[PDB]
Amino acid sequence: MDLKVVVSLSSRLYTDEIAKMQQRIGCILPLASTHGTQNVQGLGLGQVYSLETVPDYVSMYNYLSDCTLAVLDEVSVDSLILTKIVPGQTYAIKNKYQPFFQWHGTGSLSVMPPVFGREHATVKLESNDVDIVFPMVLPTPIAEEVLQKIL
Amino acid sequence: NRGLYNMVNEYSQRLGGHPATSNTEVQFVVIAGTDVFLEQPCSFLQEAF
Amino acid sequence: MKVQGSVDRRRLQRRIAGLLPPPARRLNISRGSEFTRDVRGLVEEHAQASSLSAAAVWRAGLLAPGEVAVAGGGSGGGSFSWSGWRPPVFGDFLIHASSFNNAEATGTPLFQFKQSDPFSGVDAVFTPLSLFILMNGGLTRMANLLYDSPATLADLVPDFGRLVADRRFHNFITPVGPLVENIKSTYLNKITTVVHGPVVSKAIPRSTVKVTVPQEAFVDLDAWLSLQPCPADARLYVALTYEEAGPRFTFFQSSRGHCQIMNILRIYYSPSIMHRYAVVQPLHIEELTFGAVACLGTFSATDGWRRSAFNYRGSSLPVVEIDSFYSNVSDWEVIL
Amino acid sequence: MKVQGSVDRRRLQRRIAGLLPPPARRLNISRGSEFTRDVRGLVEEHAQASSLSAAAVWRAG
Amino acid sequence: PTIAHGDGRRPSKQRTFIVVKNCHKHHISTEMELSMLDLEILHSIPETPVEYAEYVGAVKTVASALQFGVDALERGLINTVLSVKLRHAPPMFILQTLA
Amino acid sequence: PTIAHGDGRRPSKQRTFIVVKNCHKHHISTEMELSMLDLEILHSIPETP
Amino acid sequence: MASNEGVENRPFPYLTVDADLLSNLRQSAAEGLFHSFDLLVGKDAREAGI
Amino acid sequence: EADNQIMGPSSYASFVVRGENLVTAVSYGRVMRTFEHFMARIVDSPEKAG
Amino acid sequence: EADNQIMGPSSYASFVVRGENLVTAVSYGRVMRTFEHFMARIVDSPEKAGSTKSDLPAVAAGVEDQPRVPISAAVIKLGNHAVAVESLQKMYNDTQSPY
């Protein structure tokens, strides 16, 4: 079973933006299409969390529930390689999320939309004129306190 | 303050701080060490006898 | 001629030849033959062990890309879709050796209390009997034999007075799953359970593992309730119940469904809700909650949960045992 | 223990020879000869000018 | 490599270390003086036996100067080796117990 | 190259440009289906016509 | 600390030396004796693909 | 139409890393196109006008 | 002194940077040492094990098969060891510089 997804870029990335995205090599990105070759306009949340219109919490929630998640594995000058998350498989993730929360073994992790600043969730790719945005992954007991307090 | 082996290396391979002059009437501090063939074991311990 | 495109025929055929064949099912049967080389291959299931030799490892097929071993090395390799057998995910815990009694049934479901000291290195893990003595014939005589000086368990949970009062004790306890392996060490034991997977023994000569629950606590929700369907699966549940007498722990079995079960548990606990709500505690802010429920896994209906004794220290305890368990933990749902 | 890392004979033999000759001075005049190609070596002024050609530029110095 | 233990201690898997060392460079030089009279009478030719004796004196002097320089190079090479060793020799009252 | 001029211009020295071009990569993929009946009956020997 | 400056884990044809270098490793790595050193544990011990 | 047909190659032009290119790809990350030609122009036939 | 003399090489072992080394030095910033050995173990003979006897010649780019001479020093034996002992104070004095 093939889980690899190759994201090809229209234009080569700057030597700086490679350093930015490599720092986030192990983390979950939601994927528009489940097919093997893909575009760059798909993976970010820039569609739902965008600079031009007002963002909604209940709109990003509806998206992450339907969407297909993925894990970053390697970044090239002109490429992005991911592996889909599907049932009946065990994955190894890392936590690289700018507001830092400690994780615990044998716990329950939750994938919730970024309720902190944009700057913490985003990596701007000026070369392709898009920003890729990551969902935040909290331990569920932490995610509940954060929700009801900002609410 | 740095590592133990770093200190051991710097002991011999780097001149200590402001050592005294030799074969002079009084002892000045030496900036340029040509003859200088000295070594000071109390700078390590920080103890005087 | 021109080199056929970029793609090369007779080179993709070889590569796709490996991917094509699906696993074997629906073999034809002849009473004359009645046991064949064909019938064997369909039945053999390729155990995953070895004798520790570089040549013997290739024989068994441990060094294979898929998550499960395919025997014969490359031969018969590339099916990758066969009964969706998923290996178990084991968990490793480091325990105070005086906290865990070594004489445990090898299959008993475990529970981990989430400590509140940062950067620790040891964990607190409880059996159904440890939880009995902590929460304070039957379990009373047997649990006290296994665990004397209940103080050492009270030392692990220092807020237990506070937690059961605010009715938030359950969310710091996370179910982990049945025992699989236990190393017996003087100071810090090493316990291995199986979380989210077919509970299977890792010993060298294989033996079937069956999760065991004391019969005093286990309550068949399906018989107490007694056209209806007969489905394949049945599920095991736990209910932590804050009563007037004190917190309590019970296990349940039924194959109805989640929305139904949450209704049957409210009917089952109606006598005990009225009592607490009238005798001792009418009302307060935090003290409103009654209890929680979680699901511990799915086992086969129509079988499982035989009854047996647990013999230790010249005294027995009637215990039920479930076969072919598949550990699968969900979070706690408040019943009230 | 054989020869040396920086051998004196090898360096002194070739490199030293070019640096040694200093500009000539006080050549003695012989009335009998009255002029030689040697006296030209002392007098010559060695002016710096050329013809724009690869072979002439090298000749010019 | 490791040992396999019967205790609970979590095991170290296969481990490898990778170390990198670098060069250090050194320089050596010496100066010599040669007299202009010496050089000029060397590059001239003698016309009388007194000037020929002076000539052989000049050639001996220049050869001795070059030999002096070469010997200085050799002494300096041995000197720099010994000084590198001395730099990297830690003291004995440290090394005896640290070893 | 350059041109030599009698005017007052400041002389343009010998000039050379060094230029660099980089590769671009493209990926391509298709999907095909095969039914389980087809994938099965291919491997079992057929007896009847 | 200053982990690795010129360490390169490219696959090389490594020369096998009988001298035992494995006598001052975790002690030297712990405090610090090497300018640039890298520790590769577990799966990372393999040779990297070219 | 003038000629209504043309001529052209039928096979591709293959490129592989075989020898010193392989050893440089291992030891050194970089790889050279026509390593043999670079050798021929640097060491084999130097001081020759291109 | 158990020996009163030792035996050692009489000329230094060379390093020459001509060939594929030259090509890689011109094209890329790097120079390989024993490019021949790298190539022999990579492309000319892969899938070949590692042995110290097998690799001894390769690591022996030095004194291996260089002429032998006697060198005058005093040797002393401590236990299993045989160690030389020297003093260059004469080399420093006959130049009138501190030892």
UniProtKB/Swiss-Prot annotation, chain A:
Q: Which residues of the full protein are shown?
A: 1 to 151 of 301
GO annotation, cellular component aspect: host cell nucleus; viral capsid
Q: Which coarse location class describes where this protein primarily resides?
A: virion
**Compartments in which it is found:** Virion; Host nucleus
Subunit and partners: Interacts with TRX1 and major capisd protein/MCP.
Family that this chain belongs to: Belongs to the herpesviridae TRX2 protein family.
The gene that this protein is the product of is TRX2
Alphabetic keyword roster = Capsid protein, Host nucleus, Virion
Q: What is the annotated role of this protein in its UniProt record? A: Structural component of the T=16 icosahedral capsid. The capsid is composed of pentamers and hexamers of major capsid protein/MCP, which are linked together by heterotrimers called triplexes. These triplexes are formed by a single molecule of triplex protein 1/TRX1 and two copies of triplex protein 2/TRX2. Additionally, TRX1 is required for efficient transport of TRX2 to the nucleus, which is the site of capsid assembly.
One of the record's GO molecular function terms: structural molecule activity
Protein name, UniProt field = Triplex capsid protein 2
UniProtKB/Swiss-Prot annotation, chain C:
Listed under GO biological process in this entry are: viral capsid assembly
Q: Which organism is it from?
A: Epstein-Barr virus (strain B95-8) (HHV-4)
Quaternary data: Interacts with TRX2, MCP and capsid vertex component 2/CVC2.
Q: Which Pfam families match?
A: Herpes_VP19C (PF03327)
Q: Which family does it belong to?
A: Belongs to the herpesviridae TRX1 protein family.
Q: Which GO terms describe its cellular component?
A: host cell nucleus; viral capsid
Q: Which InterPro entries does its entry note?
A: Herpes_1 (IPR004999)
Q: Would I find Cytoplasm among this entry's keywords?
A: no
Major location (coarse): virion
Subcellular location field: Virion; Host nucleus
One function term, GO molecular function aspect: DNA binding
The UniProt keyword set, sorted, is: Capsid protein, Host nucleus, Virion
Keyword Cell inner membrane listed: no
Q: What does this protein do?
A: Structural component of the T=16 icosahedral capsid. The capsid is composed of pentamers and hexamers of major capsid protein/MCP, which are linked together by heterotrimers called triplexes. These triplexes are formed by a single molecule of triplex protein 1/TRX1 and two copies of triplex protein 2/TRX2. Additionally, TRX1 is required for efficient transport of TRX2 to the nucleus, which is the site of capsid assembly.
The identity of this protein, by name, is Triplex capsid protein 1
- In the UniProt record, the gene name given for this protein reads TRX1
UniProtKB/Swiss-Prot annotation, chain D:
Q: Which organism is it from?
A: Epstein-Barr virus (strain B95-8) (HHV-4)
> Which purpose does this protein serve, as stated in its record?
Structural component of the T=16 icosahedral capsid. The capsid is composed of pentamers and hexamers of major capsid protein/MCP, which are linked together by heterotrimers called triplexes. These triplexes are formed by a single molecule of triplex protein 1/TRX1 and two copies of triplex protein 2/TRX2. Additionally, TRX1 is required for efficient transport of TRX2 to the nucleus, which is the site of capsid assembly.
Name the record gives this protein: Triplex capsid protein 1
Q: Which gene encodes it?
A: TRX1
The text of the family note is: Belongs to the herpesviridae TRX1 protein family.
Question: What does the UniProt entry say about where the protein is found?
Answer: Virion; Host nucleus
Query: From which residue to which, out of the full length, is covered?
Result: 1 to 61 of 364
Q: Assembly state and interactors?
A: Interacts with TRX2, MCP and capsid vertex component 2/CVC2.
Q: Which domain of life is it from?
A: Viruses
UniProtKB/Swiss-Prot annotation, chain E:
Provide the protein's localization.
Answer: Virion; Host nucleus
Q: Report the superkingdom from the record.
A: Viruses
Q: Which family does it belong to?
A: Belongs to the herpesviridae major capsid protein family.
Q: How does it assemble?
A: Homomultimer. Makes the hexons and eleven out of twelve pentons. Interacts with triplex proteins 1/TRX1 and 2/TRX2; adjacent capsomers are linked together in groups of three by triplexes, heterotrimeric complexes composed of one molecule of TRX1 and two molecules of TRX2. Interacts with scaffold protein; this interaction allows efficient MCP transport to the host nucleus. Interacts with capsid vertex component 2/CVC2. Interacts with the small capsomere-interacting protein/SCP.
Function statement: Self-assembles to form an icosahedral capsid with a T=16 symmetry, about 200 nm in diameter, and consisting of 150 hexons and 12 pentons (total of 162 capsomers). Hexons form the edges and faces of the capsid and are each composed of six MCP molecules. In contrast, one penton is found at each of the 12 vertices. Eleven of the pentons are MCP pentamers, while the last vertex is occupied by the portal complex.
Q: Any idea what this protein is called?
A: Major capsid protein
Q: Which part of the entire protein is covered?
A: 100 to 198 of 1381
